[PDB]
Design a protein around this ligand. Structure first.
Ligand SMILES: Oc1cc(F)ccc1CNc1ncccc1-c1ncccn1
Lengths: 242, 258
């Protein structure tokens, strides 16, 4: 019968892989600014997801061909013994695209690799994409206009965005991104007990409550950040200790 | 001695103890000005009535509008955005129509979704600040084998997803019948797959379940639906995957009001 509280089965041998694509600088021809603070984000995420049982693999400043090769490689190995899959992008972006070192990649191309017909062993399992990407312009706060569309994907995907249309993404050059900081704080405290979209909702509250009435940089005043997640999940998702 | 200090609470819920639940608007579009070259939407009136009963049972004041022109629709939604919602828990707005990109069709023209949600952001609607603003959108691509000229068996019509899964402001929840690359289904007597399943879940669980948890059940119900191969073989590969884009900041329940 229909169960209103059904949860994803998370009792496989492994939690699964968490991929992190970390982009700090870009080929000069793209004329994009460096992303100081992103290495703090990478380390923060690595610790949180490792603690949740994930096998975390980080890749710094891959070219687009290299990045596509790597994510395709992961999409074609067996996830039969895994609970789920996580993929994080830390970069600049525009519209449907995220930047690699030398060129843009379409988000739909990346998510498409993990759809049922392409990745059988993840069918019915959570596929979670976390995207910290917006428009490229001592602890300094950099402020970027939202630019990356809050795109959906297939069944059992969860697409998590640092910022919604009309708002602004913030990154501290020492402490890291507002969104990743608050995400990681919540993961550390509640990741192993709370339902994951409930947790992302806490992240929405934390980030949107950060004040922008008195910035060190006067030009940043009033540039609020509101994250968003787009859920195509079909069950409750927990990361209880394995 | 106990009280809730202002510490971060992982279980915080929207306060839903106002005098009224709030207004639920339903914009119901069954047919369109001939110049738009859009097909009729048989079954949408079942959707409208279904939604009216479920949201009324949850305490909402439901107001339905059928086939408004774009000017009329904008006037009406602007009217609602400019009254005081001080005594309300929340606000619901439903669109049942065709759509394309960031647009929903009214009777005679397209309207941009951001124009509609924009009316309810921050100071434009102060009395809804910090309160859930829930938009439910059943809108996809009208099949246009259908002349540019001036014009009950249960059939399942299948429309490609066309409307962007747009976000909005803080405390908005944007609910979409279908995601990019999938297909929306509507039975000409029984109504839309998404609305049918939304309404069934509202009736069974609406008064207890956290609302995004309920929307997740709707995702499961809809994405598991299949058409019978005999009635329409051409619909075989056309799965429906709904989604919701949450900018909510707290848990949302619709417990019966005291
Ligand atoms: O979500 C956003 C985030 C931003 F930073 C800026 C603008 C938008 C709104 N646009 C979209 N949002 C979701 C899905 C598709 C689109 C979309 N797709 C094509 C063209 C326009 N919008």
């Amino acid at each position: 019968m229909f169960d209103p509280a059904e949860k994803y089965k998370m009792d496989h041998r492994r939690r699964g892989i968490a991929l992190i694509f970390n982009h700090e600088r870009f080929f000069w021809h793209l004329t994009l600014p460096e992303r100081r603070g992103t290495c703090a984000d990478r380390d923060n995420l690595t610790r949180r997801f490792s603690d949740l049982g994930f096998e975390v693999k980080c890749f710094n400043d891959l070219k687009a061909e290299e990045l596509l090769l790597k994510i395709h490689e992961v999409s074609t190995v067996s996830h039969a013994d895994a609970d789920c899959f996580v993929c994080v992008f830390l970069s600049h972006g525009e519209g449907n695209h995220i930047y690699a070192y030398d060129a843009k990649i379409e988000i739909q191309t990346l998510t498409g690799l993990f759809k049922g017909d392409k990745c059988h062993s993840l069918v019915g399992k959570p596929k979670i994409f976390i995207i910290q990407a917006a428009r490229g312009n001592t602890n300094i706060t950099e402020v970027d206009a939202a630019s990356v569309y809050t795109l959906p994907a297939g069944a059992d995907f969860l697409m998590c965005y640092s910022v919604a249309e009309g708002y602004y993404s913030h990154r501290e050059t020492v402490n890291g991104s507002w969104y990743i900081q608050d995400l990681c704080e919540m993961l550390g405290k509640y990741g192993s007990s709370l339902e994951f979209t409930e947790l992302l909702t806490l992240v929405n509250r934390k980030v949107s409550q950060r004040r922008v009435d008195f910035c060190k940089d006067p030009s940043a005043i009033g540039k609020k950040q509101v994250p968003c997640f787009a859920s195509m999940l079909t069950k409750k998702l927990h990361f209880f200790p394995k």
